[PDB]
Write an enzyme that holds these catalytic residues in place. Sequence first.
Site, PDB file in Angstrom:
ATOM      1  N   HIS A 165     -64.330  32.886  81.992  1.00 50.21           N
ATOM      2  CA  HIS A 165     -63.900  31.511  81.801  1.00 50.21           C
ATOM      3  C   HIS A 165     -65.069  30.523  82.019  1.00 50.21           C
ATOM      4  O   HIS A 165     -65.400  29.721  81.126  1.00 50.21           O
ATOM      5  CB  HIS A 165     -62.746  31.208  82.774  1.00 50.21           C
ATOM      6  N   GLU A 166     -65.692  30.596  83.200  1.00 50.34           N
ATOM      7  CA  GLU A 166     -66.796  29.710  83.550  1.00 50.34           C
ATOM      8  C   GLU A 166     -67.986  29.807  82.625  1.00 50.34           C
ATOM      9  O   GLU A 166     -68.652  28.810  82.351  1.00 50.34           O
ATOM     10  CB  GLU A 166     -67.249  29.950  84.985  1.00 50.34           C
ATOM     11  N   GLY A 349     -52.262  47.822  51.060  1.00 49.52           N
ATOM     12  CA  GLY A 349     -53.210  47.975  49.969  1.00 49.52           C
ATOM     13  C   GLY A 349     -53.804  49.367  49.968  1.00 49.52           C
ATOM     14  O   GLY A 349     -53.516  50.161  50.862  1.00 49.52           O
ATOM     15  N   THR A 358     -44.898  64.407  64.830  1.00 51.05           N
ATOM     16  CA  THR A 358     -43.590  65.003  65.070  1.00 51.05           C
ATOM     17  C   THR A 358     -42.538  63.896  64.930  1.00 51.05           C
ATOM     18  O   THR A 358     -42.908  62.732  64.714  1.00 51.05           O
ATOM     19  CB  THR A 358     -43.526  65.595  66.483  1.00 51.05           C
ATOM     20  N   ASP A 361     -40.105  60.362  61.063  1.00 49.93           N
ATOM     21  CA  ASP A 361     -40.870  59.196  60.643  1.00 49.93           C
ATOM     22  C   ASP A 361     -40.615  58.607  59.242  1.00 49.93           C
ATOM     23  O   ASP A 361     -40.386  59.334  58.270  1.00 49.93           O
ATOM     24  CB  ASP A 361     -42.360  59.502  60.857  1.00 49.93           C
ATOM     25  N   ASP A 387     -38.028  63.152  57.754  1.00 50.52           N
ATOM     26  CA  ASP A 387     -38.784  61.947  57.348  1.00 50.52           C
ATOM     27  C   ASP A 387     -38.102  61.306  56.138  1.00 50.52           C
ATOM     28  O   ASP A 387     -37.296  61.956  55.479  1.00 50.52           O
ATOM     29  CB  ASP A 387     -40.241  62.294  56.984  1.00 50.52           C
ATOM     30  N   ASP A 437     -45.970  54.105  37.590  1.00 52.36           N
ATOM     31  CA  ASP A 437     -46.649  52.884  38.037  1.00 52.36           C
ATOM     32  C   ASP A 437     -46.749  52.873  39.566  1.00 52.36           C
ATOM     33  O   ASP A 437     -47.488  52.074  40.151  1.00 52.36           O
ATOM     34  CB  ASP A 437     -45.992  51.598  37.492  1.00 52.36           C
TER      35      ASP A 437
HETATM   36 CA   LIG Z   1     -44.008  60.197  65.216  1.00 58.25          CA
HETATM   37 CA   LIG Z   2     -50.828  51.995  50.330  1.00 58.66          CA
HETATM   38 CA   LIG Z   3     -53.882  49.959  53.386  1.00 55.71          CA
END
Ligand SMILES: [Ca+2]
Ligand SMILES: [Ca+2]
Ligand SMILES: [Ca+2]
Length: 453
Positions: A165-166, A349, A358, A361, A387, A437
């Site tokens: 800080h100082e 991106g 694991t 997800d 997943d 696409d």
């Molecule tokens: Ca995980």
């Molecule tokens: Ca990507």
């Molecule tokens: Ca990325």
Amino acid sequence: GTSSAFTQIDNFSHFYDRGDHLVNGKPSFTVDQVADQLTRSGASWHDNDGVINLTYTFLTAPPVGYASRGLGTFSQFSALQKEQAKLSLESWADVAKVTFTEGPAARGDDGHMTFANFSASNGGAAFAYLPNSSRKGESWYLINKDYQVNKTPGEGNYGRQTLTHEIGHTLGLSHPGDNPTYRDAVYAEDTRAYSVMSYWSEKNTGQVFTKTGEGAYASAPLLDDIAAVQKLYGANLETRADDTVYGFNSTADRDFYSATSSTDKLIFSVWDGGGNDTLDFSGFSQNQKINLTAGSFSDVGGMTGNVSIAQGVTIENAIGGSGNDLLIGNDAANVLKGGAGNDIIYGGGGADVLWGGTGSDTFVFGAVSDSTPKAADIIKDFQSGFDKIDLTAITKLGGLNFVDAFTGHAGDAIVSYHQASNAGSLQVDFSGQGVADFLVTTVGQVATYDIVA
Ligand SMILES: [Ca+2]
Ligand SMILES: [Ca+2]
Ligand SMILES: [Ca+2]
Ligand SMILES: [Ca+2]
Ligand SMILES: [Ca+2]
């Protein structure tokens, strides 16, 4: 509508947004507005070698006219303080083009700094002067029976931050505003969540670093601080231009950037001059929310609003912990490893390398541009049945039409597989142009049910 998964992502990439709105009745300031705010005195050290070279001296004896200051008994800096002071200086020297060499005022330097301790409580916990006053570069620290803070400065405590800080003050930064409280602040983000210069705590702005009874203060310059010091003296691009890992298994060689335990309280702002970088919060067990966006905030190690990436910095990789995290990337190739648990990963991106680890997800896509055919994402540990690939951000729950070949009708997708190399691939025709696409490649089978759209 989108899925819950996506919203959690969108919301967190907006949870800390600054500028053009009221928060706690005070205007919200973008970092730039805060960099302006923090350097409003016009005071700074001068230069045309394009760098500031300051020298400093831990005062051995009291200067001329010392007694007239009313600070009492003059004391020299201990080895502990000197050692912590040096880390603080350094922490400033990394982000901006300024250097501090221990030594006496020289003929060829841009100014001189001095550290000293006083004993009389009348002086205050600590103080420094702006680089354009007569007592420029000085900073004094209180040390007596009733005030022991500056006695043992160390990472995480206020004794150390007080030094950061100082030094910032002697460098040219001023307190965010002019018995005052956060009610009296000029802007919202006037908390030590954004600046080491603020008098207010992170709770005024919603963040949570520690609980009652414990202290937690960032040792190095936080978000706003770096922008302000860089506005004054320019960014130091040569610092850590190599491949730096931050957090656990860190290769940052800085105490404030280091974590070796689950209980660690990390409060920092990443500054880096180039290379390919990683934020590894793998040693954490709590739910984290890592955002790789430049100038954005993360909720790390069981805390919130505690970590950030400095404005104008590119951090390419993130490693969550064994909690249900969230990982948000940038427009660059990202290796995002959820690590372990039920987390949601957002590449963004470019072609990202996503590892769900694991657990069950979720890999989310918000644009067709995130996962294009000519530069697609790759989920290396894709486990079908558990997943799930979320496209609800793009399809709005309108569904897809799984087929073997494209019929030139929009929303036609194709789950393919190549056993002889364990690899599946989700292809889509969002435009209905007849060709792909959007494309995501996996390692491990992806079924049509594993898609959410
Ligand atoms: Ca995980
Ligand atoms: Ca990507
Ligand atoms: Ca990325
Ligand atoms: Ca680096
Ligand atoms: Ca995780």
